[PDB]
Amino acid sequence: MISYEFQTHLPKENKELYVQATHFNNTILLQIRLNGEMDSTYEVSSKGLYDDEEEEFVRDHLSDYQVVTKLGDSADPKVPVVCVQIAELYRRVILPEQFSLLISMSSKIWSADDNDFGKLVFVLKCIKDMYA
Amino acid sequence: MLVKTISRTIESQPTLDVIATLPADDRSKKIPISLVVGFKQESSSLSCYYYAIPLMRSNVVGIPLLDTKDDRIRDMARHMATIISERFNRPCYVTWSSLPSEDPSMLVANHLYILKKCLDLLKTELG
């Protein structure tokens, strides 16, 4: 019933970037399309759950995920990085303004790398600007 | 803009709630259809996420991306994605959204109705 969306162009012929998200009780379904295209899907889920307070800081900020490739390349080093960052954005920021996230996206958005941190930050900003 | 999403209720048998992401400009090609479909009340679960695409260029190949153990839900999502992909000759992602209150026997009883109404909507919305 509730759709979230955001349409822009990748920085700075500018390709259209389209983000959309539907939120459910078990999961969020996120689309990230490049010129309308979308060719991969990943499931991102959280891995379970004198002296010092740093060891609880560590455990309270250890945030590991399982990234499962449902469609597309299952051995892209840049994917689990993007997926976890998107997942963490949802957990720490977007909700609010349990964890499962299904991400369908264009692999064409992403020493093989191109401009990867800037492009990662921009996509994260787009998702946040959606109110994901 | 090359894609757009629309929110639709289909009325006048259960009322259906739809979010569809669609090519803004359409013949039969590269931009996938995504459909979220469920019953409407008046929170929901993503019960199944199904993908289909034409194999050649009819053969359409499909697979559950998020599977369900419930055949009644799986059948619907499979048929929806596969028939949409055939109908429009493009890839299709389908989500079946389950109301907290859903009795999936309703999907069985209204199976053909649900498919045709979604095809009808998509025809119009793709022109």
- List the single best residue of B6, B31, B43, B46 to mutate versus A (max A Cβ within 10 A): B46
Residue A45 CA to residue A84 CA, distance in Å, equals 9
Alpha-carbon distance values, A18 to B3, B29, B60, B125 (Å): 8, 18, 26, 19
Residue of A nearest to B92 (CA): A38
Amino acid at site A60: D
Q: Give yes or no: residues A43 and A59 share one domain.
A: no
Residue A78 CA to residue A19 CA, distance in Å, equals 19
Cβ–Cβ < 8 Å for B33, B22:
yes
Q: Give yes or no: residues A56 and A117 share one domain.
A: no
Hey, what are B100's tokens? 């907290």
Q: Give yes or no: residues A38 and A101 share one domain.
A: yes
Q: Residue A119 sits in a domain of what CATH number?
A: 3.30.230.90
Q: Using CB atoms and an 8 Å cut-off, which of residues 35-64 of chain A contact chain B?
A: 35-38, 41, 43
Q: Give yes or no: residues A113 and A102 share one domain.
A: yes
Residues of A in contact with B5 (CB under 8 A): 3, 5, 20
Are A26 and B45 an interchain contact pair (Cβ–Cβ within 8 Å)?
yes
Kindly state the helix (H) or strand (E) to which residue A101 belongs, with its residue range. Answer: strand A100-105
Amino acid at site A51: D
Q: Count CA atoms within 13 Å of residue A80 on its CB side.
A: 13
Are A22 and B95 an interchain contact pair (Cβ–Cβ within 8 Å)?
yes
Q: Residue A59 sits in a domain of what CATH number?
A: 6.10.250.2050
Strands (E), chain B: 3-10, 16-23, 33-39, 45-54, 60-66, 92-98
3-state helix, strand, coil in chain B (%, to 5): 30, 35, 30
Question: Min CA distance, A129 vs chain B (Å)?
Answer: 17
- List the single best residue of A29, A102, A130 to mutate versus B (max B Cβ within 10 A): A29
Q: Give yes or no: residues A22 and A68 share one domain.
A: yes
Are B46 and A29 an interchain contact pair (Cβ–Cβ within 8 Å)?
yes
What domains are defined for chain B? 1-127 (3.30.230.100)
The domain total for chain A is 2
Pairing assessment for the beta strands A28-34 and A16-23 based on DSSP bridges: antiparallel
Cβ–Cβ < 8 Å for A50, A18:
no
Residues of A in contact with B36 (CB under 8 A): 22, 29
- By three-state DSSP, how is residue B63 classified? strand
Q: Give yes or no: residues A105 and A115 share one domain.
A: yes
Amino acid at site A121: V
Cβ–Cβ < 8 Å for B93, B51:
yes
Residue B17 CA to residue A126 CA, distance in Å, equals 26
Q: Give yes or no: residues A18 and A57 share one domain.
A: no
- Cβ within 8 Å of residue B23, ≥6 positions away: A36, B2, B3, B29, B31, B33, B90, B126
Place of tokens 């000759």: B89
Cβ–Cβ < 8 Å for B92, B53:
yes
Segments forming the whole domain that contains residue A74? 1-50+64-132
Query: How many angstroms from the chain centroid is the CA of residue B13?
Result: 17
